[PDB]
Amino acid sequence: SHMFSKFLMNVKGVTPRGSDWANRLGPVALFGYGAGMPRRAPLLDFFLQSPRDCDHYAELTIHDKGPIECPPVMFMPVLNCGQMLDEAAGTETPTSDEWYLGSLEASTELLEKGYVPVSVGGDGSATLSMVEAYKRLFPSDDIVIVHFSARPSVSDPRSPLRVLLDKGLLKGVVSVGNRQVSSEDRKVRKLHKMFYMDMHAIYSKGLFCIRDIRNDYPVFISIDASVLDPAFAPAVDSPVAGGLSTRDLLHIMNGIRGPKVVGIDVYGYNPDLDVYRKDNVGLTAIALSKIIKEGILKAYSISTHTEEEGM
Amino acid sequence: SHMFSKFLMNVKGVTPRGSDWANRLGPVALFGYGAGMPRRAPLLDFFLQSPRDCDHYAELTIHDKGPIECPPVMFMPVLNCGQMLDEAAGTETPTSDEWYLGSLEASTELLEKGYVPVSVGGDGSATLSMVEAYKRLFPSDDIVIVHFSARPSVSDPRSPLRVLLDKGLLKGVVSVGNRQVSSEDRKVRKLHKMFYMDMHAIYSKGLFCIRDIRNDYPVFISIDASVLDPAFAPAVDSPVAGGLSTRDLLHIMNGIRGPKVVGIDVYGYNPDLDVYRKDNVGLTAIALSKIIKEGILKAYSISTHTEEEGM
Amino acid sequence: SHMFSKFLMNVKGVTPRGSDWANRLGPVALFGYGAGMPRRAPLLDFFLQSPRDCDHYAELTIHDKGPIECPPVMFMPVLNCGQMLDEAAGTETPTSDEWYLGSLEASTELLEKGYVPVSVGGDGSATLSMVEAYKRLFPSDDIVIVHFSARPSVSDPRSPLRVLLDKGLLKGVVSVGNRQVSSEDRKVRKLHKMFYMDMHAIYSKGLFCIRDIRNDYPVFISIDASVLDPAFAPAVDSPVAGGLSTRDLLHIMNGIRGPKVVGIDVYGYNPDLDVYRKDNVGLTAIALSKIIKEGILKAYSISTHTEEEGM
Amino acid sequence: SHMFSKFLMNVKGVTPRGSDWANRLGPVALFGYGAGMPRRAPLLDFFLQSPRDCDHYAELTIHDKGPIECPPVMFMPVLNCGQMLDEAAGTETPTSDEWYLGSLEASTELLEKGYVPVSVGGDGSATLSMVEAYKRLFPSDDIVIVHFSARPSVSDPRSPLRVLLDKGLLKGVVSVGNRQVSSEDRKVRKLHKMFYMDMHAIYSKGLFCIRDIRNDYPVFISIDASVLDPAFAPAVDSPVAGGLSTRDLLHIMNGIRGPKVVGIDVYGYNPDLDVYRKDNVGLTAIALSKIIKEGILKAYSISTHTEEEGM
Amino acid sequence: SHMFSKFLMNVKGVTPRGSDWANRLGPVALFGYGAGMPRRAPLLDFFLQSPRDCDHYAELTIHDKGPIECPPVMFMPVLNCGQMLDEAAGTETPTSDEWYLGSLEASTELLEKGYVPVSVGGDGSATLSMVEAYKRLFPSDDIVIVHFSARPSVSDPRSPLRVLLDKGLLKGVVSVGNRQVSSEDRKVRKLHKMFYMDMHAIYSKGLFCIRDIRNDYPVFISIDASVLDPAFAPAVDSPVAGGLSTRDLLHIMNGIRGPKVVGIDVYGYNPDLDVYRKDNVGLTAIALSKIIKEGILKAYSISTHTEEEGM
Amino acid sequence: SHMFSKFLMNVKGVTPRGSDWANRLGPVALFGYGAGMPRRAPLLDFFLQSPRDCDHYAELTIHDKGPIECPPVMFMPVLNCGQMLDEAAGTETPTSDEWYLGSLEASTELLEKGYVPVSVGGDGSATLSMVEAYKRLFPSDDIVIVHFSARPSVSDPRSPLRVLLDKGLLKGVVSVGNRQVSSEDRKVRKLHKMFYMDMHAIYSKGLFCIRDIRNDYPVFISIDASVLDPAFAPAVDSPVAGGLSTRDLLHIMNGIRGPKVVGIDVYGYNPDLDVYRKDNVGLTAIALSKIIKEGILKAYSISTHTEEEGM
Structure with missing residues (x-):
């Protein structure tokens, strides 16, 4: 789509992960997604104006353009790739597959350039295209997805999470915070052996005794x-x-x-x-x-x- | 009152609890209350358009008219009796006793037709007329009421909860979530031996260690x-x-x-x-x-x- | 400032703490602060119209003018001194130091008249002038401050809390609920040996196991x-x-x-x-x-x- | 029995509860029981040589003979009535009913002399005779018994706890720490509506969330x-x-x-x-x-x- | 070995699992193991004389010889196969492999006769031969072992638990209660991806928040x-x-x-x-x-x- | 005393802390104390034969004589100085002050040789002489003592812990696990502002919510x-x-x-x-x-x- 032209032109123009980043995790790339949501997407911009200090005693640093220099001292660099949909690039609205291909290409490039992609906004269809973009590039690596939602959202054959499970790119799935489980939800759950922690289950077991989830898979x-x-x-x-x-x-x-x-x-x-x-x-x-x-x-x-x- | 005519005409036109419901709990009847509240009552309609799946892995099924067939498979039938106050039946506003008699008659009929009455909306005066409607029909059965409120609401002689305690239809009362207890509240409490769990008491004892309340009474x-x-x-x-x-x-x-x-x-x-x-x-x-x-x-x-x- | 004239004229016209209050804690004086905030300050008035019953089974009693008579029976007298800034006393806006001197004088008088000063509104600059007003009058007594905020707010040399720590009127400081700690915040923390309980720390340790803070200092x-x-x-x-x-x-x-x-x-x-x-x-x-x-x-x-x- | 002669002669020779004890709880009388146990009973003597300081910051004071003077200052007087069975008073062994009558008479006298009777040793048959001795003297007062044992011990018709429940002197029974519940135990439980807290139930709910049991009955x-x-x-x-x-x-x-x-x-x-x-x-x-x-x-x-x- | 002759002669003379046991779990076979321990093994006999009532409201029933009839009513049948080592069958002491073959044969027969084998006594070598006896008979079924010990006991190549992991009959291993972990223990752990819960870890996370372990494998x-x-x-x-x-x-x-x-x-x-x-x-x-x-x-x-x- | 001659001769013959130990904590010196206890003291020897692996994944290494080489790899060297009282050095029994001077000299030497002294056995009089030996050598450093006991043991003027508090070498004292507090104990407590955590207090607050004690002092x-x-x-x-x-x-x-x-x-x-x-x-x-x-x-x-x- 031409709506993502200016964005994607900048993404694959990004200087790759430096040699000084070798074994350390990161860095992080950030971009604004907007599939299934209104054209005006203020969440990305609102985040960029937010305070940089985290809960844990560290600090985010944001750069519109690289090169992303590796810090020695509690600095965590973030590459702002901006909005995927270029505002005032037309009155057109990108389709589901146009958002898919645009997200698939962007996340693919950022991944094999060493960056950890973080998508903000949209309806959750970015989840589908991002772990796929990871599975194409890393066919050997197995993926486990931690999912936070009020609903499993896997009872629909076209649902982003089920499509991943139907194509079988996922080793395991952890659903957290469910509180609207349907009849079809329980069935799709059992078939793929989803691990889940519903709201009543989480709240009755104590939230302080939930220390970690444990995984060896990405x-x-x-x-x-x-x-x-x-x-x-x-x-x-x-x-x-x-x-x-x-x-x-x-x-x-x-x-x-x-x-x-x-x-x-x-x-x-x-x-x-x-x-x-x-x-x-x-x-x-x-x-x-x-x-x-x-x-x-x-x-x-x-x-x-x-x-x-x-x- | 003529405001409840169309409603009540439908309530006592409801086909009674089937013989297949014998020893199992239910079914559930639902109606909209609106005493002490504005004429526009959207809570009932907003509930009817809400998702049917519960926290616990079951499902609500709603029927405007019966007969309420008993399910084998996590289905929980609900009889929607609609709004008690018929909209566009006049500009008049029902009185406190008109709401009382209307609620008393409706809940009485639904109870002896096997249905568990659930009242939605109002100021809480439905509590008075419903357990009374139960006490008339079931003189032998003793009633215990679990009450959730920020205030005991029993310091007023005309308060729905105290009227029940003054007439003595209640075996016991459990007040939950109180955080505005007055001088008169403590006195009425002690006289009737109310069990209470104030907010600070609940929160300091741990909410996870509150597993049940225990009762043998309805x-x-x-x-x-x-x-x-x-x-x-x-x-x-x-x-x-x-x-x-x-x-x-x-x-x-x-x-x-x-x-x-x-x-x-x-x-x-x-x-x-x-x-x-x-x-x-x-x-x-x-x-x-x-x-x-x-x-x-x-x-x-x-x-x-x-x-x-x-x- | 002339904006605080009518207010301050009433404060030092208050009949002092009665001889019947001897060793018991209290009483409590209340006034409205408004530095760094819009002229319209509704928080004080909204509190005065709020219910008097507390969480713990006691009762607040509010008097605009004294004498504050000591109760035998769960009554807690409060002296309402009103708004510091007199409305319709001019279109002028008091300066930072005008608010400081006005708060310093008011809290000084109320303190040595036996009242425990409670300031409502403002930007937190009242914290500076009130414990100073206490330190002037009680040079021997040591002060410890319990601070509730999302941020330590001590990285600024002109910050009310740091000014107290730079002048050294504080024996100890307990920061509660921090979740935005900067690099400069950690440094100022360590220098003064601040005790802190961040949000993630409080929430992971369990909120029910936080019973008290313990202090022998005022x-x-x-x-x-x-x-x-x-x-x-x-x-x-x-x-x-x-x-x-x-x-x-x-x-x-x-x-x-x-x-x-x-x-x-x-x-x-x-x-x-x-x-x-x-x-x-x-x-x-x-x-x-x-x-x-x-x-x-x-x-x-x-x-x-x-x-x-x-x- | 002549085995309890020297003991009982001393019990009803005890100067009654002083007029200075009016509304305060206590005092406490102590004696050694030994039914169903070997003649040598060292538990009483071992307790009398034990340290006097309690967990809670108070202190026990033990007097062989009165008058038991009421303290102002964390002193808790205890009247040591000694061993019920007089050693070297014969080679005979008291019968079940001889222990019953001896315990019934001793606890009766101590109760109506104002003392709270505490029996040490035996097989638990003292439980039967003591609350009976209380029920005879106080026919109006209702009794609730808190029972600590590994077994309900109410499946036997001659069991001390069931005899109390068969004669109906008990308003309620709270069994704590059960972990060997038989088929007959569950039946006798349900008939009398016993409240119980088994070991697995206590341990899984958390022992820290067990703060109190609550009772208005003695x-x-x-x-x-x-x-x-x-x-x-x-x-x-x-x-x-x-x-x-x-x-x-x-x-x-x-x-x-x-x-x-x-x-x-x-x-x-x-x-x-x-x-x-x-x-x-x-x-x-x-x-x-x-x-x-x-x-x-x-x-x-x-x-x-x-x-x-x-x- | 001739020491196990009388025992084994009785084991394969046991009438197999009845057709009325179809889909229900059980029944349970019980026998006394004694490898690496003194000839006198009183644990089995001491268990047979112990009370039959469990923590959970059920009851054990013990039969020396069958047929094991399936109960409708909280009855749990147990087949006592007695001691493996026949007392007074000689002064000889069975070897490690003699205990192995004897345990392998006994557990094999009991398993394919429908019984769940429970071994009591020994040094833990029974663990090796029993899950092997299960793996031979059920080659398709995968086995997960929950292990309770103060030490991982897998640093020795001849250790019963490591032998299972070296031969690879185990899908997963859960070690519980470890508190003496050696350097070699950590290495063998990581290689087989053992899940472990050390004493300090269990005690610091809270024992009440340990509700289950979760497994789909036998x-x-x-x-x-x-x-x-x-x-x-x-x-x-x-x-x-x-x-x-x-x-x-x-x-x-x-x-x-x-x-x-x-x-x-x-x-x-x-x-x-x-x-x-x-x-x-x-x-x-x-x-x-x-x-x-x-x-x-x-x-x-x-x-x-x-x-x-x-x- | 000549009873400690062979021991002390070996203590001040120990090669001091190596230059490779610079800023790292340790190493640890170990010796057997025996004041107020029988001549036969098996606790030291029983510890030396105990397993070396700790709860936390590390390992103790014990050397009778140095030099104590600093490890890179979870090794924790321990210098065994043996028993203070030389067995078969006479039938004499060292006095309270002989134990004091012997412990004072030994702990002094080990401290200024870089070793952290650990005393095993005795009646607790070693506590007095060891922190004194530390206070002599390090006059600037302030000492805080964490004390584990069933009793405060500070009501006696000659008690090792009170002597430290009377001479004032202690900045603060934390008593843990007290459950026998006397009248004199509470008084000595308040005078020195001891921090205490009694058994009932520890157990009712939850042992899992006791994560640390916090101290900046040695x-x-x-x-x-x-x-x-x-x-x-x-x-x-x-x-x-x-x-x-x-x-x-x-x-x-x-x-x-x-x-x-x-x-x-x-x-x-x-x-x-x-x-x-x-x-x-x-x-x-x-x-x-x-x-x-x-x-x-x-x-x-x-x-x-x-x-x-x-x-």
Whole structure:
């Protein structure tokens, strides 16, 4: 699509991962997705103006263009690739497959250039194209996906998560925060042996006794904003009450385990469905901006088990 | 009142509980209450358009008219009796006693037709007329009421809960989520030996160690939306901060114990006091719609203690 | 400043602490602060119209003018000194130092008249002038400050909390609820040996195992509304998601330990940044009104450790 | 029986409860029981030589003969009535009914002389005669018994606890620490509506979330040593592994609630079945001596709910 | 070996699993192992004289000879095959391989006769021969072993657990209660990807938040008595302090998940190393007798996840 | 004394801390104390024959004579200085001051030779002489002592812990596991502002929520075996039931925080008071041997707070 021309032209014009990044995790590339959502996508820009300091005592640094120099000192570089859909490039609206190919190509290039791709916005279709872009490039590596949502979203044959499971690129799937499980959901679950932690199960077992998830396989983090309670993230289609707090999600996200992060998809946010402050700042934009930040931090600090190392 | 004519005409025209429902709990009848609240009551309709799948892996099925056929397979039938107040039946507003008699007659008929009555909306006066409608029909059965509210609401001689305690139809009362207890509240408490779990008490003891309440007596569930924190349910008169989350309420509601559910009253919701999304969907309507659903599920799965049964 | 003339004229016209108050803690004086915030400050008035009953089974009593008579029976008198800035006293806006001197003089007088000063509104600059007003009058007494905020706010040399630490009037500082710690924040922390409990640390250790803080030194409670999650208190500058619930803050506030309360500063609230109900009631005003109440209660019930006393 | 002559002669020669003890709980009378156990009963004497300081910051004071003067200052007087069976009063062994009548008469006299009777040793038959001695004297008062044992011990028609339930002197029964429940046990349980907390139930719910039991009715504490794990109290018939630690029992005992303590029965200890140190001190004697002490303390500090009182 | 002649002659003379046992789990066969331990093995006989009632409200029934009739009513039949080593059959001592072949043949026959084999006593070499006897008969079925011990015991090439991992009959291994991990232990661990839960890890995460282990593969339970603290089970070689209580082990054992139980090995008990009561009853015999009972119960109630089923 | 001649001759003949040990903590010197205890002291020798692997994945290495070479790889060197009292050096028994001077001189030399002194055995008088030996050499450094005991042991003017507090060499004292607090104990406590965590307080707050103690001052660890429950450590004078398990003590010991460890005193063990296995191995010797090992490990891994460091 010509809507992604200016964007993609800049993506494959990015200077690759430096030789000084050798064995260390990262760096992180960031771009704005917008499939299935209104043309106006403020989540990316709202994140770029947000404070740089994370929960854990580190700091994000954002560069529009490289080269991404590797830091010695709690600095975590982020490559802002901007919005995928070029504003004022026409009144046209990209199709589902146009978004697919555009996301597939962008995430492919960023991956084999050493960057960990982080997609922001959209309907979650970026999850499909990103782990596929990873599976094409790394046919040997097995992928496990941690999914945060109010619903399993795998009862639809065309659903991004099921398509991955039907094509069989996924070694395992961990669903977190489900609270609307259908009859077809339970069936698709059992067939693929999905691991799940529903809201009532998480809340009754204690959230403090959920320390980690444990994985040796590369992890893809797919975060639907609907996993959060409508009080924290009301800007979602079909809100389901009794969800995670923003702090709850951050706690569980801190327990993600694995070798490297193959990609991140933060989605489900619609500006037309948000609760706004009197200064017209959306409540969900505030919540997700924090989650995106701690997600980028996670790509720099991901490992296996929670241990007692060093002297 | 003529305002309830079309409604009540349909209620006592309902085909009674089938012979195939014998010993199993249910079914559930549903109707819209609106005493002390504005004429426009959207909570009932908003619930009917909500997803059918519950937290626990079951499914609600809604029928406007019977006969309510008993399922073999995680189906929970619900009889929608519609709004009690017929819209466009006049500009008149029903009185407190007109709402009382209308609710008393409707709940009486539904009860002795085998249905478990669930009232949605109003100011909580439905609680009075429903357990009375149960006590008239079942003089032998003793009633215990689980009450969720920010305030005991028993310091007023005309308060629906105290009237029940003054007439003495109640064996015991469990107040949950109180955080505004007055001097007169403590006195009325001690006289009737009310069991209570204030917010600070619940939160300091741990919410995960609250597994059940235990009861051998038929339970009536009276849910005031004010028990929820204003961040989740702002559509209440005199909001009191430091309340339960929607998930918190769902957890405690799951611990309700007893033989059968005599009735449910979800109230305290006013559309004029809600926090709205940009698409004009109320935050409290979203919260309560989830609670109503898990309440109907509770009427189908209610028992005593939490055990290890079967092979 | 002439803007505080009518206010201050009334403050030093207050009949001092009665001889019947001898060894008991209190009483409590209350006034409205408004530095760094819009001229319209509704938080004070909104609190005065709020319910008087606290979480703990006591009751607030509010008097515009004294004499403050000491109760025998769960009554906690509060002296309402009104708004510091006299409305319609000119179109002028008081300066930072004008607010400082005005707050310094008011809190000084109220302190040596036996009252525990509680400041409501402003940007937190009241924290500086109040513990200074306490240190001037009580040069022997050492002060420890419990600080609730999303950020340490001590990386700025002109920051109210650092100025206290640079002048060295503080024996110790306890920061609670931090989740945006900068590089300069960690450095200023280590130099003064600040005790801190970040959000991720508090949430992972369990909030129920946080029973008290323990102190033998007089405590000043500085409460920034930003410590609360934006879902509960959105009316703050630069909202940081993943914060405390209103109940969370109340629980931690209940654990405050010390001999007496030297003063309270509830701030960070801006009406222009609040999420409003359809009846135009701000969500943050509701949250803070509860916190102010339990703060006044804390000044009447403060002690050391949590014990098993009496028979 | 003539075996109890010297003992009983001293019991009804005890100067009654002083007028200065009016409304305060206590005092406590102590005597040695020995039904169903070997003639040599060292538990009483071993307790009298044990340290006087309790867990809670108080102190036991022991007097062989009165008058028991009421203290102002953490002193808890105990009247040592000595061993019921007079040593070297013959080679005879008292019968079951001889122990019954002897215990019934002794506990009767001590009760109506104002003392709270505490029986040490025996097989638990003292439980029967003591609450009966209380029911004769106080026909109006209702009794609830908290029972600590590895087994319900109510499947036998002649069992001390069932005899009380068959004659119906008991309002309610709370069984704690059961881990050997038979088929007949479940049946007798359901008939009398016994409340029980089995070991697996207690341990899986968390022992820290067991704060109190709550009761408005006078409590009798019957403590079988078999409720303790054999590692702590091996001196019992038919030891059942997987029991409470000594600390576990002390924690649960601290949660006992009620107006007054009607009596205490510590039993199940047999010197022939104990694990001994190299200095020939029994392990169970050490454990029970601590429990007896905190039981006497409980009779002086018993109340309803766990509250926030005083200033 | 001729030492096992009388035993083995009886084992393959056992009437096979009845046709009425079709899809239900069980039944359970029981025999006494004694490799690496003194000739006198009292653990089996001590278990047979122990109470039949379990923690969970069921009951064990023991039959020396069949046919094992299937119960309708909380009855769990156990086939006592007696001691493997025939006492007074000679002064000879069976070799390591003689114990191996004897255990391999016995467990093979019992398995393909429908019985779940439970071995009691020995040094843990029964673990090797039993899951091998299962792997020969069921080549398709994959085996996962839950191992309870103070030490991984896989650093020795001839160790029973490593031999299984070197031959590769094991799909996965879960080590529970380790507290003496060597350098070679960590290496063998990583190579086979063993899942482990050390004592400090279990105790710091909370034992109540350990609800289950989760498995879809048939489970073999290997229980070394050394996993228990020496205070509960001192009768082990090289006791390691800071171990599980008997209740702790029972709690974790209750969380075992899987389709069926392939076998149980309770070992590590030596009568010469036990702490004895004055009546010469061993403390470890008491502890293990309880664990064996709840292990047999586990073979009758084993499933996957901990759910909310039925109506 | 001539009884310590052969020992002390070897102590000041020890080659000092190597230059390769520069900034790293350690190494650790070990010697056997025996004041107030029988001549036969088997605890030291029993520890030297115990397994070398710790709870945390490290390994102890023991050398009778140096030079103590610094390891790169989870090795923790220990210098065994042997028994202070030379066996068969006479029938004489060293006096209290002879033990004092002998311990003072030995610990002094080991300290200024770079070694962290660990004393094993005795009555706890080694605690006095060791932190004094540290205070003489390091007059600038302030000392905080973590004390594990069933009793505060500071009500006696001649008590080792009070003597330190009367001379004022201690900055702060943390008492852990107290359960026998006297009237004089509370008074001496308040005067010196001792921080304490009694058994009932520790157990009711949850042992899992006790993560660390926090200190910036050099820590001395004084461990009385009486802090452990008599079931784990019966070899103490005046056993007090309801104490810590061995695992409990290990958990709390892991939470010790500070710069360096100034010394360790493990005492209170008497072989004449132990519970023995049938092979005559003492139960307390087993428990303490584990604690000594994890104490030496603590001297090598001690730091401040529990953090998230490294990449």
